[PDB]
Amino acid sequence: MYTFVVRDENSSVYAEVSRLLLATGQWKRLRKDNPRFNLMLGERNRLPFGRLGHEPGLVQLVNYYRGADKLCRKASLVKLIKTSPELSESCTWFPESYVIYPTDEREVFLAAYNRRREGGNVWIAKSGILISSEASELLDFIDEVHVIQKYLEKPLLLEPGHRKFDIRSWVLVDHLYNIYLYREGVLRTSSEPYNSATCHLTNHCIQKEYSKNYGRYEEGNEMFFEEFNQYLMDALNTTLENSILLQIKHIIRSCLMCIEPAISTKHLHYQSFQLFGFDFMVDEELKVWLIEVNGAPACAQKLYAELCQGIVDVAISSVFPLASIFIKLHH
Amino acid sequence: MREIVHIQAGQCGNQIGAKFWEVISDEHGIDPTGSYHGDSDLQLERINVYYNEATGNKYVPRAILVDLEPGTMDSVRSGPFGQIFRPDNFVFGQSGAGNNWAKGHYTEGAELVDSVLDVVRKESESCDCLQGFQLTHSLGGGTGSGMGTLLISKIREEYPDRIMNTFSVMPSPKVSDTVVEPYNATLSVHQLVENTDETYCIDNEALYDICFRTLKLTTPTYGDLNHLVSATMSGVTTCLRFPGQLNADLRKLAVNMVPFPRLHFFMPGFAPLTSRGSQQYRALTVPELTQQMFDSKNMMAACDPRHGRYLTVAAIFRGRMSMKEVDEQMLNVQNKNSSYFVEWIPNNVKTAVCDIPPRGLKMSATFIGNSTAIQELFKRISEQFTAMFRRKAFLHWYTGEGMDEMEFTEAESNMNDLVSEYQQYQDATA
Amino acid sequence: MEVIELNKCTSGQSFEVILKPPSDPSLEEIQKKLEAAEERRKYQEAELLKHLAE
Amino acid sequence: MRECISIHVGQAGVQIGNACWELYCLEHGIQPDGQMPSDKTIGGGDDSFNTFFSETGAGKHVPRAVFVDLEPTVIDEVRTGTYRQLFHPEQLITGKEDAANNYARGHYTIGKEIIDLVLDRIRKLADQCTGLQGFLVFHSFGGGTGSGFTSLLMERLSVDYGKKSKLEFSIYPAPQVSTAVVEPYNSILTTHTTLEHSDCAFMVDNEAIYDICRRNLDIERPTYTNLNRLISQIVSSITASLRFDGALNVDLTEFQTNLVPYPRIHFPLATYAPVISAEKAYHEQLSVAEITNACFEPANQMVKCDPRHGKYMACCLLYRGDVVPKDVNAAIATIKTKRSIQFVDWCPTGFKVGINYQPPTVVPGGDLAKVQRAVCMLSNTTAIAEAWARLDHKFDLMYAKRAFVHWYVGEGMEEGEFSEAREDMAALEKDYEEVGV
């Protein structure tokens, strides 16, 4: 009998994995502070990594990579891409970005911002968000730590509706640092016509709150890959795999391989896996841009069952065998 | 040379005490005449813990034999190992204690106790560095129970910084029909809670049930019962008697086993369970030893360990075996049943391994548990006590010796408090 | 990768390599503590012997 | 030449001391006899090895060492053992009954009765020094003597020898070989009281050593003997510079200067390679690049922790054997591109390197294979605070219920000392996190 503990009650993904593990009959759930576990489903913050892997006779596995926050915080990601030769100042799939502190790259941001105006200079400040062409306004918003990023002025727009979207991809990294891209992604769509001058933020919460047109084109402003691929074929004579997924797989690999020496648990006294949510924008030319990486993603409702089973099969039972939905991104 | 002084009182005390000395004398290669005739240096290395040396290289048990009637001690002196004991260490009266705690503690025992303390003092003075005392007695009679606890209190007064350890035999209606035993036992437990550091709860209920259920003895005798007791006493004193790392003296054992001073009542266990002369031919495997030593059926106290939680555990393995396999199996018990070990005492299970097996076995293991389930034993005694005491039944035997009912009420209250304190830590979370 | 302060002898050598630059209580007090603890032991023992005398 | 006195306290300190002094004798060519043919100066010397050995008129080389235990069995084995002629009886100090795994018993109850004797015996060794530079103190965290008596001794050394440096070699407790449930209590108590009195402390987690012996020496169930032979090799690596001609870490003060920028943050991580089984028939000898790279593997550290997720304040590489600077620098260059090595902002990114050409010595019939080159890395990394976090958590679990606390209060310790020690540890964890994150 394998044992596990649960230390993040607010996780929809690991609630299901937990339910699945119990249903096997070969896993038992311990009190959260019992140290004799095989598997820790950890808390989102200040996870006690230093206490893992010091239990005689237990192989111990945890569902986070220590250090993965470098990818999963806005400011850290910017710094990581600029200062990693593997990614470099010249990296063509990440929008121009600068770290700014209220009350730092401020000067450098202006230096290239002045370049922009003489002679398209819309940017976005991320922490509530503010999109503006006035540099002066953005800096004020920050003051009362943020990133300032070039706002994609020419998004790919879905028809009917003339509406923007973003793509979420789910990536599982196992204890061997195998990189697994889940088959199914989701498009988080705006239900409003994109207005050049609620309709700029594809956020699911924001759409539900502020959009009259929430849900008309698709269930809960979510378009899945089968439909989107069919749309790409009909409107643009191409495929999801060719126009977009090739780039997406390139970006995911680049990011995670960059960070591998720093966070790999290959020769460590405990082991890690982690589920990531990568978010992408695509522009008019079918170029894919990375927006951000989420270290603790939720999942789309109709994908929970399959994804979570996949986590158990690949990340957990691989280490603790009982008695594919993923594409392996080969290094 | 950290000496232990052994005292055995009353019938039960002297019966199991004498068997203890037979069993460990054989282990240490000492014959009934006190002559050493063993083949290993391991046997003599800490022999001074339990034996004095005489001239002619005679080894004499540091043992004092006490009773208020001569019968059992006459038996012992005429037994196989009768000659081994120091003749002046036989201290006895003629009156008997009539199964009456008050006679043992207050009247008959009081007339004899100074004589005993004189012998105790002579033994202690002879010690390079005395550790403390071990006492064998029953709680259900009069001498071992009443005079035994009187002795404990007087020894504590003269030796207040030494460890006091007892092997205390709890009464059961499965083995005795004497009606006053729950009174004697409750009065004694009151004394033990206050004045011992470590008490091994040897339950006649458990002993009888092992003999009847497991050993398939249809008519268990005291000989059969005491066979289990002497196996247990040998196992739990192994770390004191042979070279070793863990729990190698009485104080280090107490510091490992007793997290709160009143909770010092241990549930012993043993594997394999054998009857006298069963003489079995297959050695147990390390996994078998480990599974059986933790099994309810192998406990010498009639308490279900699954009804409580382990505060602390000591496990002792004896024989030639893989220490790697021992470690693995011990870890497996804890990791497989982690909920039964309190989580607020990290790493609370300690393991010792001794190369020398007990006589007749290639492999054996002894368990010492400080479990909150031991409350079941005290509850059993308390229920029997209250059934009589609510009607003040049989109290005249005690008030005739000068006792007041208040003393019974205080003893009962203290034991019920002990029960409640176990329950408290049973329900406690980290 | 700058090597500095190379020192050699028949037994071995030592050097430093830089990759990148930067960017109480008295004897008296002790004795008192040991005696205060001793007095607490003695007090606790005294209480026990008083209890046994009762 | 300036002398160093070693003090070995409790069972772990003594048995590790046995192993070390045996190794020192082999390395320097000193017989159990106490005789050293190679020492052409008879009866007195100014040599580097005289830092650790004094000389008699008859040419006996005597360890500048005191062994202290509150119980006599372990020091009795030194007295009757192989190296009995090496030490004179006044160096070997025993009591009758031990501290029963109880810090308070070791520090207050028994320590009060023997501290003046021990100090008088240390004083006698100090009187034979022309330039005593200080002390090396060996002890466990977990034992009652190792924890309790050591902290008393350290306080009194600060008083009697205020100018003198004090280094520790401390055994951190591990359940796989530990003998008391209360070892976390003793650990926190002794660290709290010793912290201001120690200039530099090398912690060795029995868990790390245990696993190295399992994994690399193929020992199924390591004994203290297996553990101590490996530890003595690490200790010898660290003290080699005091005992041999050299220009790095040549006196105790230089350890603090080189490894300890902040006085409370004085616990350098040791990492050692290679550890090879003497039973391995065929063995390929490892290059400078390979043994140096091995220094950045948690599997080879004296404490298991992850330096990728802390910062470095200092790093020293100590080589023994066939090693030249060009190969060290090439190895380092390469490792820096490959590995996560971040220094704090206010410290140069760099390594101090010492090379001693004599390969490590191994005890005949021991577990370790002879190798042509070895290295011990000493790094002051904030990652070692993982060990304090582990220990503090165990402490918190027990202390919340006051489990076993009555044993300490019974020896005259006040309960308030527990929380005072724990507060100090909380502050220490806070210091590390500030420096490292």
Ligand SMILES: CC[C@H](C)[C@@H]([C@@H](CC(=O)N1CCC[C@H]1[C@H](OC)[C@@H](C)C(=O)N[C@H](C)[C@@H](O)c1ccccc1)OC)N(C)C(=O)[C@@H](NC(=O)[C@@H](NC)C(C)C)C(C)C
């Ligand atoms: C279950 C309760 C005890 C155990 C048994 C046992 C007593 C015994 O063993 N006794 C009475 C001293 C003699 C001893 C045995 O002979 C029978 C010898 C061979 C012995 O075991 N001797 C051992 C080796 C010796 O060290 C020794 C130990 C203690 C005392 C004396 C002698 O006899 C079956 N008894 C009373 C009984 O079985 C009695 N039954 C009852 O009391 C029942 N109630 C009526 C219930 C309690 C079982 C019957 C005799 C009527």
Ligand SMILES: Nc1nc2c(ncn2[C@@H]2O[C@H](COP(=O)(O)OP(=O)(O)OP(=O)(O)O)[C@@H](O)[C@H]2O)c(=O)[nH]1
């Ligand atoms: N590496 C190593 N650790 C040891 C050795 N002996 C004991 N230990 C460890 O030290 C701790 C126990 O402390 P000891 O040094 O035995 O105790 P002591 O200092 O003699 O103190 P008391 O015996 O309580 O007076 C446990 O963590 C043991 O695992 C040894 O020879 N080598």
Ligand SMILES: Nc1ncnc2c1ncn2[C@@H]1O[C@H](COP(=O)(O)OP(=O)(O)CP(=O)(O)O)[C@@H](O)[C@H]1O
């Ligand atoms: N540089 C940019 N250009 C164009 N649109 C952008 C952009 N940065 C962000 N957006 C839009 O803003 C929305 C939310 O951005 P972002 O992902 O930074 O917020 P968030 O991380 O808090 C929500 P989540 O964590 O689920 O991705 C995205 O759906 C995207 O449409």
Ligand SMILES: Nc1nc2c(ncn2[C@@H]2O[C@H](COP(=O)(O)OP(=O)(O)O)[C@@H](O)[C@H]2O)c(=O)[nH]1
């Ligand atoms: N296990 C065991 N129990 C005994 C033995 N002799 C008596 N008893 C039990 O001890 C209790 C009676 O006490 P006993 O020692 O005979 O009285 P004492 O002589 O006044 O101390 C009863 O519960 C008996 O069952 C024995 O040899 N072995």
Ligand SMILES: [Ca+2]
């Ligand atoms: Ca000389």
Ligand SMILES: [Mg+2]
């Ligand atoms: Mg986000």
Ligand SMILES: [Mg+2]
């Ligand atoms: Mg009787």
Ligand SMILES: [Mg+2]
């Ligand atoms: Mg000791």
